[PDB]
A paper describes a structure:
The protein [name], secreted by [name], interacts with the V-[name] to inhibit acidification of the phagolysosome in the early stages of infection. V-ATPases pump protons across a phospholipid membrane using energy from the hydrolysis of adenosine triphosphate (ATP) to adenosine diphosphate (ADP) and inorganic phosphate. Successful pathogens can subvert host defenses by secreting effectors that target V-ATPases to inhibit lysosomal acidification or lysosomal fusion with other cell compartments. This study reveals the structure of the V-[name]:[name] complex, an assembly formed from the interaction of host and pathogen proteins involved in the infection of phagocytic white blood cells by [name]. Removal of the C-terminal residues 415–573 of [name] did not significantly affect V-[name] inhibition by the [name] mutants, but truncations of the N-terminal region of the protein has been demonstrated to prevent V-[name] inhibition. These data show that binding of the N-terminal domain of [name] to the V-[name] is responsible for its partial yet specific inhibition of V-[name] activity.
One [name] construct, consisting of residues 16–278 ([name]-N), yielded two crystal forms that diffracted X-rays to 2.3 to 2.4 Å resolution and the structure of [name]-N was determined from these crystals. The first crystal form contained one molecule of [name](16–278) in the asymmetric unit and the final model included amino acids 16–274. The protein has an elongated and slightly bent α-helical structure consisting of three α-helical bundles. The three α-helical bundles contain four, four, and three α-helices, respectively, and are connected by loops in the bundles. The first α-helical bundle (α1–2, α5–6) also has an extension nearly perpendicular to the bundle axis that consists of two additional short α-helices (α3-α4) (green arrowheads). However, the N-terminal bundle with its extensions, which from previous analysis was proposed to be the region that interacts with the V-[name], does not resemble any other known protein structures. The monomeric [name] predominates in solution, even at high concentrations, and therefore the elongated monomer structure is expected to be the functional state of the protein. Only the N-terminal region of [name] interacts with the V-[name] and consequently a highly-elongated [name] structure was unexpected. Mapping the contact surfaces in all three [name]:A-subunit pairs in the cryo-EM map to the [name] crystal structure, the main contact surface appears to involve residues Gly24, Tyr28, Phe62, Ser85, and Trp122 from the first α-helical bundle of [name].
Author numbering: 0, 16 to 275
């Protein structure tokens, strides 16, 4: 009996704490407007017994099932903001993304939810992943994924975002011994995406250098002359992995075929 209204007070506070975690500076006026009937009981110095009585007498929203459904929506919005960190979504997009989540007929079978699930699976795997070429490839693309979700959201049709999910999950499914398949996937991604330097501002400068060295060290054993070896080493001066760099390596690899039958 009194346990139920204690749950109502708890759920009211949980929603407010979720809102405070998302928006501590009170910038999301539209989302807070949707929850003002709940938030008001936590931003005034009501004591527990007062909110408990407010639930017993109906002065606050006291349908526990309805409060939980509203809470899960806000929890999914917080997960979106948390899952893209260290990248940040602008205020108006946070609120428009919330509106899409709120208005969905079944949010928990939507691709918004499934995309968040699979994004978290990538970041979870990367937590304790050894710095192999495969995982460095995956970390680079997962970071681009987070940045594109922060810019475009998680609800609209985006072939770039789906391709990053696809290629990222494929790297995770690849065996550590399928080296040529890992590089073919990664090189293929950089060539097929539209940005000339798709990792600048997204990866740390040292991570970009490691990617450059990974491409050089992969192609170097194939070369059959010092002249072509020197041309490839001349490319290792680049601190950024660009589409141009990859094409310049492929031209050297192509020239090497003239020295082989």
């Amino acid at each position: 009996a009194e346990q139920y209204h204690s749950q109502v007070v708890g759920k009211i506070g949980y929603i407010a704490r979720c809102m405070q975690t998302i928006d501590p500076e009170n910038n999301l006026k539209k989302i807070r407007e949707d929850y003002q009937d709940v938030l008001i009981w936590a931003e005034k110095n009501y004591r527990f017994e007062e909110i408990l009585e407010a639930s017993k007498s109906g002065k606050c929203p006291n349908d526990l099932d309805a409060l939980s459904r509203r809470s899960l929506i806000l929890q999914e919005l917080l997960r979106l903001v948390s899952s893209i960190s260290p990248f940040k979504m602008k205020l108006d997009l946070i609120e428009s993304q919330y509106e899409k989540m709120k208005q969905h007929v079944n949010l928990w079978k939507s691709d918004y939810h499934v995309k968040l699930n699979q994004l978290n699976q990538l970041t979870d795997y990367l937590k304790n992943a050894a710095p192999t070429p495969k995982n460095n490839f995956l970390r680079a693309m997962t970071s681009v994924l987070q940045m594109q979700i922060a810019q475009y959201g998680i609800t609209e049709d985006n072939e770039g975002i789906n391709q990053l999910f696809k290629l990222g999950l494929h790297l995770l499914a690849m065996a550590n011994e399928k080296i040529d398949e890992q590089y073919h996937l990664f090189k293929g991604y950089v060539k097929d995406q539209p940005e000339e330097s798709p990792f600048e501002g997204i990866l740390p400068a040292e991570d970009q250098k490691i990617l450059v060295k990974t491409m050089i060290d992969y192609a170097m054993p194939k070369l059959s002359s010092k002249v072509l070896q020197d041309k490839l080493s001349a490319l290792s001066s680049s601190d950024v992995l660009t589409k141009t760099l990859l094409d310049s390596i492929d031209r050297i690899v192509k020239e090497n075929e003239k020295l082989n039958a």
